[PDB]
């Protein structure tokens, strides 16, 4: 929460 590597835009 809220990491964005690629998209993949919901983690973490």
What is the C-alpha separation between 8 and 12, in angstroms, rounded?
Answer: 11
Q: 4 by DSSP, 3-state: which?
A: coil
Distances 2 to 8, 10 between C-alpha atoms, Å: 11, 7
**Measured between alpha carbons, how far is 2 from 10 in angstroms, rounded to an integer?**
7
Solved using: NMR
Quick check: 9 and 1 in contact, CB under 8 A? no
Place of tokens 């993949």: 8
* Residues contacting residue 5 through CB under 8 Å, at least 6 positions apart: none
Please give the torsion angle defined by the CA atoms of residues 3, 7, 9 and 11, in that order, rounded to the nearest 10 degrees. Answer: -60
Cα–Cα distances in Å, from 7 out to 1, 3, 11, 12? 14, 10, 10, 13
């Amino acid at each position: 929460w809220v990491i964005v590597v690629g998209v993949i835009g919901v983690i973490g």
